[PDB]
Structure 1
Amino acid sequence: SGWTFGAGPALQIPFPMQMAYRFNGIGVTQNVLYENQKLIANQFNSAIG
C-alpha cells in the first residue's frame, strides 16, 4: 500500500510502481527504474543479505 495506509484507507499498488514514485521524490525521473530493474533488484538482495 505504500504510504497511503498511514493517512486514510489502505490502497493497493504494485511494488515497482511504488519504487518509481519513491525515485520521483528525490529528483530522479522514473524512467531510470523501469530501464534498470533487474540490476536494482539484485543490488537490493545483496544489500539485505
Structure 2
Amino acid sequence: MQMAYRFNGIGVTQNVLYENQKLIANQFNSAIGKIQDSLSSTASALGKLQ
C-alpha cells in the first residue's frame, strides 16, 4: 500500500502496482543486486570521499 501511494503520487493509478507487483519486486531486486557488482568492480565511484 505504501508503494501504491507512491505510484499515486507520481500520477499512476494503483491497479498498475496491484496487477504487476511481482514484476515490480523482481525489477527492484535486480536493481539492488546490480549495485553490489558495480561497487565491487568499479572503485572509482567514491572519488569525492577519496
- How many residue pairs end up in the alignment? 33
Structure 1 outlier segments of 4+, above 4 Å? none
Query: What is the TM-score with the length of structure 1 in the denominator?
Result: 0.65
Select the structure of larger CA radius of gyration.
2
Q: CA deviation at 1:38?
A: 0.5
| Sequence identity percentage | 100
Return the alpha-carbon distance in structure 2 between the equivalents of residues 38 and 30 of structure 1. Answer: 14
Q: Structure 1, residues 1-42: CA drift from partner, whole Å, max 9, x if none?
A: xxxxxxxxxxxxxxxx00000000011001100000110000
Q: Secondary structure at the match of 1:27?
A: coil
Runs of at least 5 residues in structure 1 that lack an aligned partner in the other structure: 1-16
**TM-score by structure 2 length?**
0.64
Structure 2, unpaired ranges of 5+:
34-50
**Alignment partners' CA distance in 2, 1:46 and 1:22:** 20
